[PDB]
Amino acid sequence: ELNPSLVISLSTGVSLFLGRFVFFNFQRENVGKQVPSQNGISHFEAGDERAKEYVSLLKSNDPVGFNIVDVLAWGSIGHIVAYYILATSSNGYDPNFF
Amino acid sequence: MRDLKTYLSVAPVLSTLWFGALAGLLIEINRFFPDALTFP
Amino acid sequence: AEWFPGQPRPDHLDGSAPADFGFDPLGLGVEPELLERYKESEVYHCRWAMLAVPGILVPEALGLGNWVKAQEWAAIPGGQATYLGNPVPWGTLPTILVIEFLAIAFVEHQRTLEKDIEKKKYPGGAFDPLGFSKDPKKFEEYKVKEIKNGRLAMLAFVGFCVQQSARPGTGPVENLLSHLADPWHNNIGDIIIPRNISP
Amino acid sequence: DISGLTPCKDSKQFAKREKQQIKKLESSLKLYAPESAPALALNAQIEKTKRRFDNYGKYGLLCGSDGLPHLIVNGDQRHWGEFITPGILFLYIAGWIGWVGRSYLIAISGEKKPAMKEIIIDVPLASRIIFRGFIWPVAAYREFLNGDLIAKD
């Protein structure tokens, strides 16, 4: 009886809002301090040409720098939450505690 | 006399005397209090 | 003063801080930064515990239920809430969970953009509309009173939890009335000594 | 009772074991004169078996589905006589021995050649030390507080 489209859209919207306005600063200040490296230098600097970061992909015109990767991550979280709600509401599970 | 007392204080002689006394004590305890599985 | 008369006080606790009675046997606050974090954590904990005690006591005193019973309308598929004997139209678990998560996540955030160390514990401004904090001496003594009342509220919360665990299906006010009925027989004794005469 | 075991005073397998032991002992009795010394010795064994089984019944032991006593170790207050009290007595005797050994090793450490008192034991010194283990818990505790128990290297 729960509309799948409404639940999925609302969960994705809420997750994107949280990622853009609430948890943005923490995530950015944490990724700033965690860059993978081997023997004191990054993987690309070591010689791994397949480990180069995509500068042309992560850039965006958002005022705070929200990009497509953030959209994918927060949308995946929202979809997971939405489908958890739909799958947990359809079943008739009753934990008989009381 | 002194030398014999020194010899009787050597490790093997003292060991056999001590373990003989212990064995006798345990044997007599088991003779008078046999088949003990618990402590009442 | 001192928490343990006749005991030297630790070097990292000199009594300048509000409610500083030199209590740190395990040495958790030796590092200054950890001590500063612990101070704000303690004040934040004290305020929540102080808010909790009236909210645990008054509803049961009014006969509205019990601080443990009031949470069991959930765990029931059709469960709906109740406020002062009045059903809450939106009082269903999936809605209240989402609202609580969003509101508390938003308010706990932007509590964290405050970087001034003194104002992480005592922000003031919109949180001090009446201006009790303008006078410094009064501000310091009110800080001492806040911490001291908060510690008592914290102890009362553990009292509530352990009383609930020890005597299931009972509430703090019910426990107080039962003790006041027969104080010399309704005590902690029959619980630490659980009705087991060893002889 | 505990773990599905029944007390040995109730279990029929225990009584059946007792009956079969006496029957096995009584078969060899047939090969001797009723007044002979071997007949007197097997009768003493029969009485010993009867006393053993009666004691196992009286002490309140639990028996399995095989008729044999089973020990309860978890800490039950009605089964302390099987592990707890004997264990305390063992821990008192072993600590006594260890403490008397430690004191003797300490007493001979500061000598010219202390390896000669380890193969030829100074018996009077040992006699002095031996009876200090009767209060070994108190001394062992007290050198823990002061710091004379553990070498801090």
Place this chain on the structure above:
Amino acid sequence: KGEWLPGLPSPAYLDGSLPGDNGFDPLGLAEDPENLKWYIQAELVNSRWAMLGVAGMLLPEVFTYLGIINVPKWYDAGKSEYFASSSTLFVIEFILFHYVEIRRWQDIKNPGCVNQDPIFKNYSLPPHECGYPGSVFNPLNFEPTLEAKEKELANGRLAMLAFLGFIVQHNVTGKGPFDNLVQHVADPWHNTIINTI
């Protein structure tokens, strides 16, 4: 300073200055001074408690045998009915002793910490010796001479031995101390420890 065993020399650390010194330490428990300072306090408090305990077990049984009063035996007074139930009494005892014994311990650790009371800061315990507070604890102002301390320690040691005797006698006979004494004195030569074994 007497000799507990005439001929045996006294240990070096037992100087004859402490009250009740008879050179009795065959097992070398008090060789370390830090241990001796603790054992003095332990002996004092144990003797003081054993004194009261022995009086409490003995005297009401003597007065019960004479008919003046009728109270249960010391080993039977536990399961009697009182106004407060055993568990409540134990909890009250635990709280009160947890206070007073920590107050006493603070004095053992350093002599002069807990002389002043918290509630009425006007008052304070005058400087004294460890184990001998006095002032309030000595309301009648009896002088703490060496003779008095020696008498206290002797009577306390006798009381501890009496307590141990009471416990073993009840464990091996099942009756009270004074009735054991009466049974022994009634016919001394057939009522001894041998006849109970």
